[PDB]
Amino acid sequence: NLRSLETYERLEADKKKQVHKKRKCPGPIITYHSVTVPLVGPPARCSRTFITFSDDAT
Amino acid sequence: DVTRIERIGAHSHIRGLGLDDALEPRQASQGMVGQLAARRAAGVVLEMIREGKIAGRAVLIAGQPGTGKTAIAMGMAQALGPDTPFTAIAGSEIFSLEMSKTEALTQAFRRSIGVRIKEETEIIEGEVVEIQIDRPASKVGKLTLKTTEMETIYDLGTKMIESLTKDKVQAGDVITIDKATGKISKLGRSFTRARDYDAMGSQTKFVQCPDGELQKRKEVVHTVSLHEIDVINSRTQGFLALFSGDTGEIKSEVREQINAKVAEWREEGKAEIIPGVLFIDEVHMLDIESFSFLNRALESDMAPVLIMATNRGITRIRGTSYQSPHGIPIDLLDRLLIVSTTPYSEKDTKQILRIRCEEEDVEMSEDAYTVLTRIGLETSLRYAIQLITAASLVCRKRKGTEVQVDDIKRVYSLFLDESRSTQYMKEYQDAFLFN
Numbered sequence A: 001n002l003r004s005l006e007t008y009e010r011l012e013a014d015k016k017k018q019v020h021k022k023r024k025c026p027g028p029i030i031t032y033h034s035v036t037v038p039l040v041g042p043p044a045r046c047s048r049t050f051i052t053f054s055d056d057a058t
Numbered sequence B: 001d002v003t004r005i006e007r008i009g010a011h012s013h014i015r016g017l018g019l020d021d022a023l024e025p026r027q028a029s030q031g032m033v034g035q036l037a038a039r040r041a042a043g044v045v046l047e048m049i050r051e052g053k054i055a056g057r058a059v060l061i062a063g064q065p066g067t068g069k070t071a072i073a074m075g076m077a078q079a080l081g082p083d084t085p086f087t088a089i090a091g092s093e094i095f096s097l098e099m100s101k102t103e104a105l106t107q108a109f110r111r112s113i114g115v116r117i118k119e120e121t122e123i124i125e126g127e128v129v130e131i132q133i134d135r136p137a138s139k140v141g142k143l144t145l146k147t148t149e150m151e152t153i154y155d156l157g158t159k160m161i162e163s164l165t166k167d168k169v170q171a172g173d174v175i176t177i178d179k180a181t182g183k184i185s186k187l188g189r190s191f192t193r194a195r196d197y198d199a200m201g202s203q204t205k206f207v208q209c210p211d212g213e214l215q216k217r218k219e220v221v222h223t224v225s226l227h228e229i230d231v232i233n234s235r236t237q238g239f240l241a242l243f244s245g246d247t248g249e250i251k252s253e254v255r256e257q258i259n260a261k262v263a264e265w266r267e268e269g270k271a272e273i274i275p276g277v278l279f280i281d282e283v284h285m286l287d288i289e290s291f292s293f294l295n296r297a298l299e300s301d302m303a304p305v306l307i308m309a310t311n312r313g314i315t316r317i318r319g320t321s322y323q324s325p326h327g328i329p330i331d332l333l334d335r336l337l338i339v340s341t342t343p344y345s346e347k348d349t350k351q352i353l354r355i356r357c358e359e360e361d362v363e364m365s366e367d368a369y370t371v372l373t374r375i376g377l378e379t380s381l382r383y384a385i386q387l388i389t390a391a392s393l394v395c396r397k398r399k400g401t402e403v404q405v406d407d408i409k410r411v412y413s414l415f416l417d418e419s420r421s422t423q424y425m426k427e428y429q430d431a432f433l434f435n
C-alpha cells in the first residue's frame, strides 16, 4: 500500500533524483573544477583546481 | 610625509567659515581670521544653500584686493562638504572656441546641480567554496557559496557560466553577483591558492568571510549632475565628451526633456535634487552678453546659488563703453546681494601670518612675527605670506631652526614687492620698452 500510496505521495524522492542528476548528455566534455581543500604540513584551507577530460581522444 | 598631488596652496589653511551654531563668527576658527560681517553673511548664504528651497539666489563678494573674497568662497566650499556640488570657475573660462558663452554658462549652471539617483539591487555576496564548469569540445555548471550563516548550491545558466568564466572565478574568492544584470565583481580572496602551483607569486591579504544571508536587497546611491545627463543624452557617444569636453551646443530640446524627466523622478521616488553652488570668481571678465544671460538664467527653477567675486570699483563693462559698479550691469546688480569685505588690522594680519606659518610648518620668532606684520601692513598680505616661505628656506639653508629677523630682512632684500619694483623700474625707465 505504501508503494501504491507513493504513486501520490512520492513527490520528494523521485523529483529530487530526476532534477539533481549527476550526469549530462553524451559526448566530449571538459570539466573545470575548483574546491576548497584543507592545508597540510575555520581551519587553514587552500584552493585547488582539477581539470577532467571525458575521453582520451580529447 | 609623502608628496601628494595636493600641496600647500594659497588657501590650504582654510577649513571652513569658523562659525558657531548661531552663525556668529569666531575671531580665529577653521583657519578664518577677522571678516566677521562677511563670514556671518557667508554663513547665512550657506544655510540658504543647504535648505535648497530657493533657486537662483545670487551673492556678490565685493571688496578690496587681498581682503579674503576667495578665502571666504573656499571656506564656504569646505563647510559645504563633497555631497553638495560646488563648481568654481574663473570668469575667463567661459570664453571658448568649442561653444558659445551662453552654452558655457549653461553647462556651468547645470554642473552645479546634482541629481541623487537611488535604485534597489539584488546582490549575492559569499565565499566560493566550489565551482564546477563542464563544456563540450552548451555549458553546464554548479556553484556553491558560503556566508557563515548558510551554504547554498546553485545551478548555473549559460550566461552566468560565461560571466563566471570571464571573471575567472575560483574557489576561495569572495565575490558579488548583481542578479539584475549578472555583473560579477570580486571583493577579494579568503585564503591562498594551492602552494603547489608555481608562479602565482602573491600573498595578498585575505578579506573576512561575509555574514548574514547570501542574497540581500541593497539600496545604492548614485549622484550625477545635470550636465552629465545632458552630455550622455546629447549623442550616442556622449559619455566620452564628459572627459574630453568636446561638447557642442547641446540642443535645448534635450535639456527640456531632461528637466521634465528629472521633475518626474522627483515627483516619483527615483531621484532627489541636490542644488549646489556656482562660484564665478573675477566675474568682471564676463561681458554684457554673459551678464544678460545670467539675468534670465537665475530665474530658472533649476538654477543653483551663484556666488561672485570682483575687486573692480566703478569700471567699464567688458564689450561696452558704460561704467557700472563692480563691472556688473545694474540689471544684474539688482538681482544680487552684495557682501563687502573690510581691510584687516595688525592683529588680524598677525593671526593670518601665524596660521600660514603653521600650515607651512615654519617656526618663527615673535620679533620676526612683528617685523613681518609691519611688512605685510606696509606692502601686502600676500607678499608677507610669500616671505614666510622664502625666509623658511633661507633659515634652513643656514641650518637654523627658527626664522629670525635676519632671514626676513634677507628675503625682503632678495624679493621685491610691486612698489619697490615699480620705483626701480621708474629709476631705469629708459631701459624698459616703450617707456
Ligand SMILES: Nc1ncnc2c1ncn2[C@@H]1O[C@H](COP(=O)(O)OP(=O)(O)O)[C@@H](O)[C@H]1O
Residues within 6 Å of the ligand: B010, B011, B014, B031, B032, B033, B034, B035, B063, B064, B065, B066, B067, B068, B069, B070, B071, B072, B352, B355, B381, B382, B385
Ligand atoms: N580671513 C582670512 N583668514 C585666513 N586667511 C585669509 C583671510 N583673508 C585672506 N586670507 C589669505 O590671504 C590671501 C589673500 O588672497 P584672497 O583671499 O584670494 O584675497 P582676494 O580674493 O580678496 O583677492 C590668501 O592666501 C587667503 O587665503
Ligand SMILES: [Mg+2]
Residues within 6 Å of the ligand: B069, B070, B071
Ligand atoms: Mg581672490
